[PDB]
Amino acid sequence: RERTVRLQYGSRVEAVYVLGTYLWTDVYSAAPAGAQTFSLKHSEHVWVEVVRDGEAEEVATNGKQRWLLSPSTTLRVTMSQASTEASSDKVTVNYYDEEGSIPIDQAGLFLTAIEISLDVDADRDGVVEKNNPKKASWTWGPEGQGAILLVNCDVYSKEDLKDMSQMILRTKGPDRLPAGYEIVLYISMSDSDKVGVFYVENPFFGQRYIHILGRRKLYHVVKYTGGSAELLFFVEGLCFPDEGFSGLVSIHVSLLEYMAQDIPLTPIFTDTVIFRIAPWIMTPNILPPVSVFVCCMKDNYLFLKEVKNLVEKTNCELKVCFQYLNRGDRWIQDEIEFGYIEAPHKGFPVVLDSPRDGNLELLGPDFGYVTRVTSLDSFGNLEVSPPVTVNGKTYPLGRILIGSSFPLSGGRRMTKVVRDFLKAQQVQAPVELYSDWLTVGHVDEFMSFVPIPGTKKFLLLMASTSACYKLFREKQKDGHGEAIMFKGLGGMSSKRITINKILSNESLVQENLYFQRCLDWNRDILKKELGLTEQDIIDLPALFKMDEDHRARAFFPNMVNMIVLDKDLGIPKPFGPQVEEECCLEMHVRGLLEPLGLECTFIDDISAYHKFLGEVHCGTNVRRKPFTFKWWHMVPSRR
Amino acid sequence: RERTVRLQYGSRVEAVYVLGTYLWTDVYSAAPAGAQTFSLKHSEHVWVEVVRDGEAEEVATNGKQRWLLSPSTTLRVTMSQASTEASSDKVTVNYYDEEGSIPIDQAGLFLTAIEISLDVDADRDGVVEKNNPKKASWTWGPEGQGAILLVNCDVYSKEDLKDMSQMILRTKGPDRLPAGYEIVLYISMSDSDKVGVFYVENPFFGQRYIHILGRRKLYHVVKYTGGSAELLFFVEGLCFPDEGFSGLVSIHVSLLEYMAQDIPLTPIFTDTVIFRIAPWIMTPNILPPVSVFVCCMKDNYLFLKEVKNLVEKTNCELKVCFQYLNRGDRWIQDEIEFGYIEAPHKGFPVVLDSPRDGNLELLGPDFGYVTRVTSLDSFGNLEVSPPVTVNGKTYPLGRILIGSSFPLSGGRRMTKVVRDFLKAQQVQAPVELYSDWLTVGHVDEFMSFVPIPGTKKFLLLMASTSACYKLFREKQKDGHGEAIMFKGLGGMSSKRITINKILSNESLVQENLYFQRCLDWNRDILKKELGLTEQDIIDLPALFKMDEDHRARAFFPNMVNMIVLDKDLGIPKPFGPQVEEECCLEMHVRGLLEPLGLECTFIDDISAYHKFLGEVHCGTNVRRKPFTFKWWHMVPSRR
Ligand SMILES: [Ca+2]
Ligand SMILES: [Ca+2]
Ligand SMILES: [Ca+2]
Ligand SMILES: [Ca+2]
Structure with missing residues (x-):
């Protein structure tokens, strides 16, 4: 999955990078008027390619290379590991006019890489595997994949949740999300009478599992903890397949970005799991x-x-x-x-x-x-x-x-x-x-x-x-x-x-x-x-x-x-x-x-x-x- | 398709045989008490096998062969061509006791063979082929089969039916159906707002096409004509696929047998075609x-x-x-x-x-x-x-x-x-x-x-x-x-x-x-x-x-x-x-x-x-x- 992130000149863009995606980056819009060429530097754990007219070349952390500024010449930015407190993950682009070799301006991109994966037992062995590539689909048969949910046929206790399916949000990253981000688990209105989801909202105060998604609750903000973390959810089916209901339900997690007051938050990244009841x-x-x-x-x-x-x-x-x-x-x-x-x-x-x-x-x-x-x-x-x-x-x-x-x-x-x-x-x-x-x-x-x-x-x-x-x-x-x-x-x-x-x-x-x-x-x-x-x-x-x-x-x-x-x-x-x-x-x-x-x-x-x-x-x-x-x-x- | 037809002793059973099926026939129930063996005769165009414990042997038109009477010894009766006025299609079973070789009783089966096939263009070439083996299913893709219907997007005239799909009831048989039979075309209540079907009910009086199946009409009795005949129907879709409607509809024809007053007619034979809109x-x-x-x-x-x-x-x-x-x-x-x-x-x-x-x-x-x-x-x-x-x-x-x-x-x-x-x-x-x-x-x-x-x-x-x-x-x-x-x-x-x-x-x-x-x-x-x-x-x-x-x-x-x-x-x-x-x-x-x-x-x-x-x-x-x-x-x- 390629995601668009543009620079802005004389200034800095800060972005969260979710592992498993990559960014394509327009450097030409941030170029000051009259600028001719650009060069770039980047940190050790950020990989940067210059892509001109489809052709990609890897760029060193500090080279002096210059490329012609063109709308068809862009950057592709990739990170393979989550940021820690020791990270300074960045890419810096310098712009030049014709007259000389000293930069006339610079545009930065500061990155925080996190892993976010909503995981389920898609391969149908009873264990929740890490990020099954097929978890967002449900297929029948000997080779089929996607997770299975039981109808519950009978503040909550963990013991009472034994019959339910496990769903785990696995994250990796620094101590906190950068300013203006949150993680939200959600379902559609339609699926709200088909499923329920339980989670311990306040683990410091006890083990109480609460019902966070279902009838009248379509979304739940989940707290981010740093380092490598797992949030455990239990999922129940509420009803069997029937005339108007195929048996399939979906649960989503999104990383949302705060834009401003009165404006909706932007879904930066979304991960989805499907269950069949x-x-x-x-x-x-x-x-x-x-x-x-x-x-x-x-x-x-x-x-x-x-x-x-x-x-x-x-x-x-x-x-x-x-x-x-x-x-x-x-x-x-x-x-x-x-x-x-x-x-x-x-x-x-x-x-x-x-x-x-x-x-x-x-x-x-x-x-x-x-x-x-x-x-x-x-x-x-x-x-x-x-x-x-x-x-x-x-x-x-x-x-x-x-x-x-x-x-x-x-x-x-x-x-x-x-x-x-x-x-x-x-x-x-x-x-x-x-x-x-x-x-x-x-x-x-x-x-x-x-x-x-x-x-x-x-x-x-x-x-x-x-x-x-x-x-x-x-x-x-x-x-x-x-x-x-x-x-x-x-x-x-x-x-x-x-x-x-x-x-x-x-x-x-x-x-x-x-x-x-x-x-x-x-x-x-x-x-x-x-x-x-x-x-x-x-x-x-x-x-x-x-x-x-x-x-x-x-x-x-x-x-x-x-x-x-x-x-x-x-x-x-x-x-x-x-x-x-x-x-x-x-x-x-x-x-x-x-x-x-x-x-x-x-x-x-x-x-x-x-x-x-x-x-x-x-x-x-x-x-x-x-x-x-x-x-x-x-x-x-x-x- | 095997169909059960039993004999009754000292008497005759008359049955319609539909080509493409065969009959299995119990001879043991009609056997008089104390009868030991049976023999049989049959006409030229009826094929008869004696099936004992799964083993089938072809029997001649007039042999003298005798078999032990057993519940596990039955007849299989097959006909490959429709009856005409020149037909006498029959099987006669004679029963014997131990004492002698003269029959103590006989049970007949008199048959009238007809062809009945409701045909549609399942192979998707624009022509209505004879009895496509796949016509009762609808499959997607290059090799897929089953007939296609258009929604009508605009007493009736044939010219006005030009946009509709053809469906043809093909029959072959003698001058009339035997006493107590009729042929009925029908649809489900559910499909009644999805389709309509038009037919000339009275071809001697003109070409007027009338709407015989659809809202409030779930069945129509169709007249049988002898020899080789075709009844032409035109079929329209009434609506597109939507949330509760897959696009598939079915039409059935049944040969019904009159039992008696106040008792439902028995569906002797049923043929089905499916359409996708x-x-x-x-x-x-x-x-x-x-x-x-x-x-x-x-x-x-x-x-x-x-x-x-x-x-x-x-x-x-x-x-x-x-x-x-x-x-x-x-x-x-x-x-x-x-x-x-x-x-x-x-x-x-x-x-x-x-x-x-x-x-x-x-x-x-x-x-x-x-x-x-x-x-x-x-x-x-x-x-x-x-x-x-x-x-x-x-x-x-x-x-x-x-x-x-x-x-x-x-x-x-x-x-x-x-x-x-x-x-x-x-x-x-x-x-x-x-x-x-x-x-x-x-x-x-x-x-x-x-x-x-x-x-x-x-x-x-x-x-x-x-x-x-x-x-x-x-x-x-x-x-x-x-x-x-x-x-x-x-x-x-x-x-x-x-x-x-x-x-x-x-x-x-x-x-x-x-x-x-x-x-x-x-x-x-x-x-x-x-x-x-x-x-x-x-x-x-x-x-x-x-x-x-x-x-x-x-x-x-x-x-x-x-x-x-x-x-x-x-x-x-x-x-x-x-x-x-x-x-x-x-x-x-x-x-x-x-x-x-x-x-x-x-x-x-x-x-x-x-x-x-x-x-x-x-x-x-x-x-x-x-x-x-x-x-x-x-x-x-x-x-
Ligand atoms: Ca698993
Ligand atoms: Ca039962
Ligand atoms: Ca055809
Ligand atoms: Ca438009």
């Missing part, structure tokens, strides 16, 4: 489970016992929650979504919370919390796929899946606010599916993903009505038509539901053929958008009843919405027709899954209610370890 | 001039005569405009900005118009018009550089320059609406300069660009107060101190302004040293952001007076704001001190410019007023040929 990332079922969270009524004893036994097979911890006045019976599934954020050498799980009636809970200090309508707004209507590659395009964090209706249908859709939020995170490249054929309208009623044990691969599990009808027709042919559904649920008994009764219900057959079309439309989108083939899919038997809106509700519990802990699957107990004292649905599902090394445990969430009307009264959710792949190494498509 | 592009002074526009009062005879003589030296045409009640005296410069838009084989000049008092003009049908506060909002405060390369980064269309104040100054700034508009065009990557030290606050008061004749290079011209003082001091030393400014302007005469009077004014010297600092701050930004060195810059003498806000107004006309027609420069006549009966400012400027092959003509815009107070009462603007470089070949930085 880390996106919220959802964890698919293939990631290692850490904790299992469940909610149910206190007396659903079978559910609790069976979930405990499942979790005991694993190294996971179980967290049990009961029901709240402000939340649905499924809230741990519907109102909470587990995700994470990550920065170099920092990261934590972050829960999205959308309470049904609003907030009046939380499990643990380890989590960050982001707190916010149709049933499509539920987090039961959100899933995320395992990492996939689709037609050469890699989605290393997987893709978020959101249930919706057909574009021209006039049906329900998840609120734009949430859809836009998920899209703005960019790294999970969301896909809309079709959930609106379901009364409740959640993708988790029809699909799930499971890892294939001993491999790096996974399966898509799809609810299938065709599979249920095939199985029931086989069992009927085998002489089992009188086999009864819902054994042990006393509130169902009077209905006497048998395989025969189901198969003879003509309207129900038609309804379920239609629901199979709905499932298949989704199957196709999933195969297209996830790059899946038929070998990646297993169909689980399912059955639905139709409501007045022509929408589906489960006839028996949807087995697809299951607890996935690696090889171990907690599967809703279906209460299917008993053949030889085993549920034919359980046996069929075992026959599909067990050969793949998956271990099935059926979990009874309905016995405590004595019947099943299509609604499940419990919920589960799993906190998982984040992906090994660092999100900033992705190269998302440009928008 | 072409940005507004500003033309720098290096581009060939076409027309010169001037505004002045009818009696400024010298200005008119001298501008006419200048333009007569060139092949340009002159357009003369007088003053209007709703517009400033400079309006052709301040309220109008000339730019263009371009699409493959189409483009026109487009004027931005921001009338002072609002609209109540226009010159010519050849232009598009975009019609919309401090003085910084004026188009005199906008410039655009010639193409530059900065640290390896190429700006093939140049960069827009916008005058502003310092970030912390609390000074004036161009309105966000305009700044955001210019930024959103993306291809000119705007840079903010510092104009707020000027009373009027326009970058055109201090800088301009000129081409260097006989080369591909250009110069930055900067106003310089230091150059003026140097020149005046020289002339004083030479014995010319009593030389008078403003000769011939009778309203200035009583002031008796001479070189001596100017040089002895101490406050004026200080003011102009400060203004030179302001000019130099800009010089530095321009060198940085345009990749310029001192060899690319010429300083023209200028002088200013300071107002109560410490802002500058011209002491004598600013020569830098000049008419640039290639080698010929119309330069405001400065009315400088006369030495040997020539203006020393004119002679100095000639001495700078003429050696470079630039021809200078001084244009007197103030004599008709008898004095000069810092305000010029005329304006000029030049319509230029667009860049040869196609904007869509740029690769702008991602945001």
Whole structure:
């Protein structure tokens, strides 16, 4: 960076020189009228070149050389080290007329060199490197650079700032700035609701960190100390990327020069750092489970016992929650979504919370919390796929899946606010599916993903009505038509539901053929958008009843919405027709899954209610370890 | 794209097959209970593979082959040509039990194959190619693809649609769609204020083009005709990219299947095209001039005569405009900005118009018009550089320059609406300069660009107060101190302004040293952001007076704001001190410019007023040929 500094004759110009720049200096304007040639002297640590018509020659500290005065003959002035108290850094230009060799006048330039660098961890290793040449830009990918900021998801203490990003103003120079200069850190009005910055303003009086930049504070004057100094700042993100906010914010430092009263100060030098605020990332079922969270009524004893036994097979911890006045019976599934954020050498799980009636809970200090309508707004209507590659395009964090209706249908859709939020995170490249054929309208009623044990691969599990009808027709042919559904649920008994009764219900057959079309439309989108083939899919038997809106509700519990802990699957107990004292649905599902090394445990969430009307009264959710792949190494498509 | 189509037993499934997809077909669900094996027949133009556990084998039209019935054994069905009236396209599956070789049941699939493709000129040659594989994406650069739309800048006639983009729905098939299908073209609500689409709905009754998609119309059912058919649509953009709008819009066509009353229609097949709306592009002074526009009062005879003589030296045409009640005296410069838009084989000049008092003009049908506060909002405060390369980064269309104040100054700034508009065009990557030290606050008061004749290079011209003082001091030393400014302007005469009077004014010297600092701050930004060195810059003498806000107004006309027609420069006549009966400012400027092959003509815009107070009462603007470089070949930085 070249900076213009002009001389003034019979006089002196004093300037601050910032290392990393150089000055170009007009000597011709300060020349007295009638002056013909000039000569110059300079101090030891100032380097001076005479540049005439583009050609630069180095000039000695004291030579007697003279050059013709011309507007196209200028000086270039460079300094490689900061001034100290021992410095006298200067350049002196002498002017001559034709008549003689004694100077007729002189113009000086007195310099104070300082180093000023606003530094951040741009190379993404957790340490703040000195003046990364790329710190003012932010690029994606394995070779990408620029600093990363976490949203704060939770006078100040340093301990409380542990989650924030460090930013360091590094300076070097003499005891004080020359008269009429100051250093100011600042942000734009636009970024003021995106960031905050903390600093100890008065270190002689204690360690108190104060909030110096953010809402209503756009600039802060920072004190200069001499010698080699560092000022430590902590920076927080205030919000995630969203529809109108890309995630990028900038912070500037400027050396300002006082001109006079009533006139703005001149920005002599400006240094800039950029941060990207880390996106919220959802964890698919293939990631290692850490904790299992469940909610149910206190007396659903079978559910609790069976979930405990499942979790005991694993190294996971179980967290049990009961029901709240402000939340649905499924809230741990519907109102909470587990995700994470990550920065170099920092990261934590972050829960999205959308309470049904609003907030009046939380499990643990380890989590960050982001707190916010149709049933499509539920987090039961959100899933995320395992990492996939689709037609050469890699989605290393997987893709978020959101249930919706057909574009021209006039049906329900998840609120734009949430859809836009998920899209703005960019790294999970969301896909809309079709959930609106379901009364409740959640993708988790029809699909799930499971890892294939001993491999790096996974399966898509799809609810299938065709599979249920095939199985029931086989069992009927085998002489089992009188086999009864819902054994042990006393509130169902009077209905006497048998395989025969189901198969003879003509309207129900038609309804379920239609629901199979709905499932298949989704199957196709999933195969297209996830790059899946038929070998990646297993169909689980399912059955639905139709409501007045022509929408589906489960006839028996949807087995697809299951607890996935690696090889171990907690599967809703279906209460299917008993053949030889085993549920034919359980046996069929075992026959599909067990050969793949998956271990099935059926979990009874309905016995405590004595019947099943299509609604499940419990919920589960799993906190998982984040992906090994660092999100900033992705190269998302440009928008 | 693989699509799921299942059989149903003892019965027939009829389906439409869209060319370019294929069907995967479950034969196992239609198998009667107890059935063991299956066999199949198919027609000549249907290709059928049996796929078992991933392994596909082609099956003959009539073989007797039998396969074990399994859920993992399916059919893949492919057709390579559209059905005609001569087609019977089908696949028939026979099922067998253990007991014998006569089929116990059969399930048919009857097919009607159609071609459906929504086509646009994605490869950017002006012709609509058949089904470009990349038409659903939009990529920048030499190899980039996807279709381009122009904003319309001006029952319908086809002639009136000449400026719009063509979009063609190409179909092939039998006489009619099978029962229960329709084809629908549609857009999102969001895009509905970005685009419009026109089509002849009733070609038997005439050629009337009607507006079928746009505000309040999100979908249109289009009639299917048999055989090979094309439906021609015309598409317009409604607005330029802006803060919340990237410029990308999408149009979809879907084949919809009727399910039943009260149930949404199923999107069987969907095809999508994307368009980018072409940005507004500003033309720098290096581009060939076409027309010169001037505004002045009818009696400024010298200005008119001298501008006419200048333009007569060139092949340009002159357009003369007088003053209007709703517009400033400079309006052709301040309220109008000339730019263009371009699409493959189409483009026109487009004027931005921001009338002072609002609209109540226009010159010519050849232009598009975009019609919309401090003085910084004026188009005199906008410039655009010639193409530059900065640290390896190429700006093939140049960069827009916008005058502003310092970030912390609390000074004036161009309105966000305009700044955001210019930024959103993306291809000119705007840079903010510092104009707020000027009373009027326009970058055109201090800088301009000129081409260097006989080369591909250009110069930055900067106003310089230091150059003026140097020149005046020289002339004083030479014995010319009593030389008078403003000769011939009778309203200035009583002031008796001479070189001596100017040089002895101490406050004026200080003011102009400060203004030179302001000019130099800009010089530095321009060198940085345009990749310029001192060899690319010429300083023209200028002088200013300071107002109560410490802002500058011209002491004598600013020569830098000049008419640039290639080698010929119309330069405001400065009315400088006369030495040997020539203006020393004119002679100095000639001495700078003429050696470079630039021809200078001084244009007197103030004599008709008898004095000069810092305000010029005329304006000029030049319509230029667009860049040869196609904007869509740029690769702008991602945001
Ligand atoms: Ca680092
Ligand atoms: Ca979920
Ligand atoms: Ca084409
Ligand atoms: Ca302009």
